[PDB]
């Protein structure tokens, strides 16, 4: 959606109209899209003030541009029923960019037609500041959801040495409620399954050989429970370390297992419940920020058009969609049309016409 918004000296509205509407006059030999642009008539009491506002407007322009890019990123970021290449842009007030723009009007909703220029800028700035903070809080909530969800994926992921055993260990196999016999969890390579069972016996005194039994298998190792007298566990685990064996210090905990299942379901549900309304809220913020952006461009248009021409202020402008590889010619035509009207002495240094870029 890259369009140039062009300001004209406006010496004759019927003439500027001809040079902008007529098929014989449409830019790049009528291949480029050329739509007229209008704003309500507005007056600014002091041009020097207008100048200050011009600088302010450029700054606001940058701010809201940042804001809308942030917005684009947050929508892109959720990826709820969407992807990077599908529904990349949203409608503003239900229509597309070109539609919005051509139907763009200064919104009393944004500012009184009698509102001061300063005040208009203020309204826009306050609005987007409000948008930015909304984005800050909702994005925080999004990131918090994403973070804890991945944390949970990790918990239910990985090898048997570190993975949660909630799905693996059954109350009937884990030795529960024994004062003297403690169960350690050991992970033995499949090729060494029988070996570590024998090794366990050699880890501590009074360690019962062959009690080691595999509860479940991993890709590299089997996870087995070993039952032993509590006093010997210190010797059991130490010698296990000596044999390059990792003994898992694990206790059955019914409440924790349920707690984790509850968090699993809770977090997924909140995720869905949040994204639904999150994105609807974000969608409103988007529409509002785009409308504001165009409002800003139009104000810049006001400022600029006044600054080049002063009074009277009928302002003529074009919204142009350049054709591919014809922007040089488009510029050349506009240069031919307005250069002699802009100045006898002769862009930013000099400009036959004032334009700004749209790219969304």
């Amino acid at each position: 959606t890259e369009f140039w918004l062009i300001s004209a000296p406006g010496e004759k509205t019927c003439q500027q109209t001809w040079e902008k509407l007529h098929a014989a006059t449409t830019k790049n030999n009528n291949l480029a899209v050329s739509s007229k642009f209008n704003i309500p008539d507005l007056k600014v009491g002091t041009l020097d003030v207008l100048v200050g506002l011009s600088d302010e407007l450029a700054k606001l322009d940058a701010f809201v541009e940042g804001v809308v890019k942030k917005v684009a990123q947050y929508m892109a970021d959720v990826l709820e029923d969407s992807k990077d290449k599908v529904q990349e842009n949203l409608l503003a007030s239900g229509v597309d960019l070109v539609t919005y723009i051509t139907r763009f009007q200064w919104d009393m909703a944004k500012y009184p037609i009698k509102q001061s220029l300063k005040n208009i800028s203020e309204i826009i700035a306050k609005g987007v500041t409000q948008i930015d903070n909304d984005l800050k809080s909702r994005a925080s909530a999004y990131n918090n959801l994403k973070g804890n969800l991945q944390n949970l994926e990790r918990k239910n992921a990985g090898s048997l040495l570190t993975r949660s055993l909630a799905e693996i260990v059954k109350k009937d196999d884990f030795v529960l409620d024994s004062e003297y016999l403690v169960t350690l969890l050991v992970v033995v390579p499949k090729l060494n399954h029988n070996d570590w069972i024998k090794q366990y016996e050699t880890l501590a005194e009074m360690v019962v050989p062959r009690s080691s039994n595999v509860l479940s298998e991993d890709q590299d190792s089997y996870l087995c429970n070993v039952t032993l007298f509590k006093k010997a566990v210190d010797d059991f685990r130490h010698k296990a370390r000596e044999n390059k064996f990792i003994v898992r210090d694990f206790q059955y905990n019914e409440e924790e297992m349920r707690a984790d299942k509850e968090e699993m379901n809770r977090l997924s549900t909140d995720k869905k419940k949040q994204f639904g309304p999150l994105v609807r809220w974000l969608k409103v913020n988007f529409s509002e920020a785009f409308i504001a952006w165009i409002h800003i461009k139009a104000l810049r248009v006001f400022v600029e058009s006044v600054l080049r021409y002063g009074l009277p202020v009928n302002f003529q402008a074009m919204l142009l969609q350049p054709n591919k590889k014809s922007v040089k010619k488009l510029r050349e035509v506009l240069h031919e049309l307005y250069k002699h009207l802009d100045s006898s002495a002769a862009q930013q240094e000099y400009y036959p016409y004032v334009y700004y870029k749209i790219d969304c």
Partner: protein
């Protein structure tokens, strides 16, 4: 075969619970008995002090009368 060894251990633990609770029950009975015996000793001790009291009181009365 590991489950039978487990059951034998569990039975041993059960016995342990019965045995310690039972020793504690005896301990409680012995304590009540201790209070009972102490009290029996006290009743006899009181009787003895009392006999001495009664002897002295009657004896003091008659000697005071002789005065």
């Amino acid at each position: 075969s590991q489950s039978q060894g487990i059951q034998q251990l569990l039975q041993a633990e059960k016995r342990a619970a019965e045995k310690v609770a039972d020793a504690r029950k005896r301990k409680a009975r012995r304590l009540k008995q201790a209070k009972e015996e102490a009290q029996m000793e006290v009743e006899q001790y009181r009787r003895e002090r009392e006999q001495e009291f009664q002897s002295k009181q009657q004896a003091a009365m008659g000697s005071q009368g002789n005065l």
